[PDB]
Design a protein around this nucleic acid. Structure first.
Lengths: 57, 152, 114
RNA sequence: GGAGGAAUACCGAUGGCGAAGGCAGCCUUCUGGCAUAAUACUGACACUGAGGCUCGAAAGCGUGGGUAGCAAACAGGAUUAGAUACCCUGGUAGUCCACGCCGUAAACGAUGUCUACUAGUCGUUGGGUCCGGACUUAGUGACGCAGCUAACGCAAUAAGUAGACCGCCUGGGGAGUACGGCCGCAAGGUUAAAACUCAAAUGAAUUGACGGGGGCCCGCACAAGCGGUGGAGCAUGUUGUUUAA
């Protein structure tokens, strides 16, 4: 998640590009999973429910 | 009222000065329907201040003082996630005028002078020169927003 | 010292911004508690912005004209700190995220029930 | 800059393997199954299974090591009327390794194993054969006929039509409890009653109601303002008391 900003460029647009890069790399979800431990059975059940939702979509 | 917005009633401008704001101010001073008393009190106070300041246009002086008095930003409470915190928001144009008029009336209520007209004239003078309880109240309203200024 | 690297330890509870040289030495640091914001007021982007401004000034006395940001942690004020640097006028060569991503190295705390 | 333990993000997918329980970084050694390919072979060697034995999550136990994170127990901080809890700051056993016990889980597909038969459709994993598609195989899911079911629903991975064998059930409690065997170091597991007690205990589904479940919407319901009750005196009604009432 490294972003390079060109010379004489607004700060806000670079900030927005950095946010897009972080979203593309999916950094936040890793930290969200890390913050709290989750039971493996709960993980498996959630994965199955997500799979069913994806199938309906 | 979770219902359509409706046009506000058209106010009747005052005769002597022919100004909307003056009658709107007289409305708040009016109590128990004594518009005749409010007219006299307001005219007396305005005449006293105008004589003291040797200004030809009391209506213009009143417009300047009211514009100074009105607060730009007022804090409004908001509920998010079962929590209550202050939120600074820009005040509505008409609400600024209404707030200033109400605050001036309230302070004129507690001014020392024996007669209401003299209390009101003193409060207008203090408001014009940025002193007194009305200016303190406006400063407090601004201060509450300035203290946190962490929302919106 | 004519080049600077900024480290931001942002976190939901609190955000810390510090200014360091290229070699890896921290000239000065700023914190929200020093500003005095507490609790919910402390954990807000503006509380991050003000401390970022203070740290930027502190670095200005040292004399670094160019600084590059290194954000760490999923704070809500990480954007506001970079906005604060931009408003101060520090020029940023690049924006990078150095958040640690541990690959199930250590067990996380038990889930909280409310 | 080191030292030490555990786990193996992304890949990752109602994906894959295993009889179940279960099994995730990477290379090596040994190792059991399954899938398919055309030949060559034995020629009923088959299915099921009382006892019996093998394995069998997590926790727990014994000896010996290791001990980062987390964390029963324990300490202190909070809300609370109290909080031997939920939140919190720490935190020992345990979880990690070697060798043995324990043999229990909502050990579930709440669905014993093995056969033959019974419309179709789109998926997806491992092979095969054909000209990116069509065809066929053993698993892997989502819909949907006949058929079955109290209804949910099942529906070639049957809960449909038949067959072989095994296990289990006979109202709800008392109770998977007591006694006696058997096992275990222990915790306790396994087999498994009776006295007594009540007319119920239940399953599916329907109509309502309710939720500190959701979606939308309305009323001076709140918001924003105006001025009142609650404080004084008095009029009025009512309890209360006193009265013959």
């Amino acid at each position: 998640p490294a972003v390079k900003v060109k010379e004489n460029e607004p700060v806000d647009i670079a900030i927005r590009r950095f946010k897009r890069a972080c979203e593309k790399a999916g950094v936040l979800s890793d930290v969200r999973k890390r913050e709290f431990y989750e039971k493996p059975t709960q993980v498996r059940k959630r994965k199955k429910a997500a799979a069913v939702k994806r199938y309906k979509k | 009222p979770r219902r359509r917005v409706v046009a506000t009633r058209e106010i009747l401008p005052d005769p002597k000065f022919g100004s909307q704001t003056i009658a709107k101010f007289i409305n708040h001073v009016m109590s128990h329907g004594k518009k005749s008393t409010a007219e006299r009190i307001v005219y007396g106070a305005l005449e006293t201040v105008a004589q003291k300041r040797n200004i030809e246009d009391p209506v213009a002086f009143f417009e300047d003082v009211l514009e100074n008095v009105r607060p730009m930003v007022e804090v409004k409470a908001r509920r998010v996630g079962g929590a209550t915190y202050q939120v600074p928001m820009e005040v509505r144009p008409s609400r600024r005028t209404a707030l200033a008029m109400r605050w001036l009336a309230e302070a004129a209520a507690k001014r020392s002078e024996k007669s209401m007209a003299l209390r009101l004239a003193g409060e207008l003078s203090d408001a014009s020169e940025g002193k007194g309880n009305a200016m303190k109240k406006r400063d407090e309203v601004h201060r509450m927003a300035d203290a946190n200024k962490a929302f919106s | 010292v004519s080049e600077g690297i900024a480290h931001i330890h942002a976190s939901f509870n609190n955000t810390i911004v510090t200014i360091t040289d290229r070699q890896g030495n921290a000239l000065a640091w700023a914190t929200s508690g020093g500003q005095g914001f507490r609790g919910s007021r402390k954990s807000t982007p503006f509380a991050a912005q003000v401390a970022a401004e203070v740290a930027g000034k502190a670095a200005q006395e040292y004399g670094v004209k160019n600084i590059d940001v290194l954000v760490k942690g999923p704070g809500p004020g990480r954007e506001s700190a970079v906005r604060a640097l931009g408003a101060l006028g520090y020029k940023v060569n690049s924006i990078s995220d150095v958040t640690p991503i541990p690959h199930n190295g250590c067990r996380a705390p038990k889930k909280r029930r409310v």
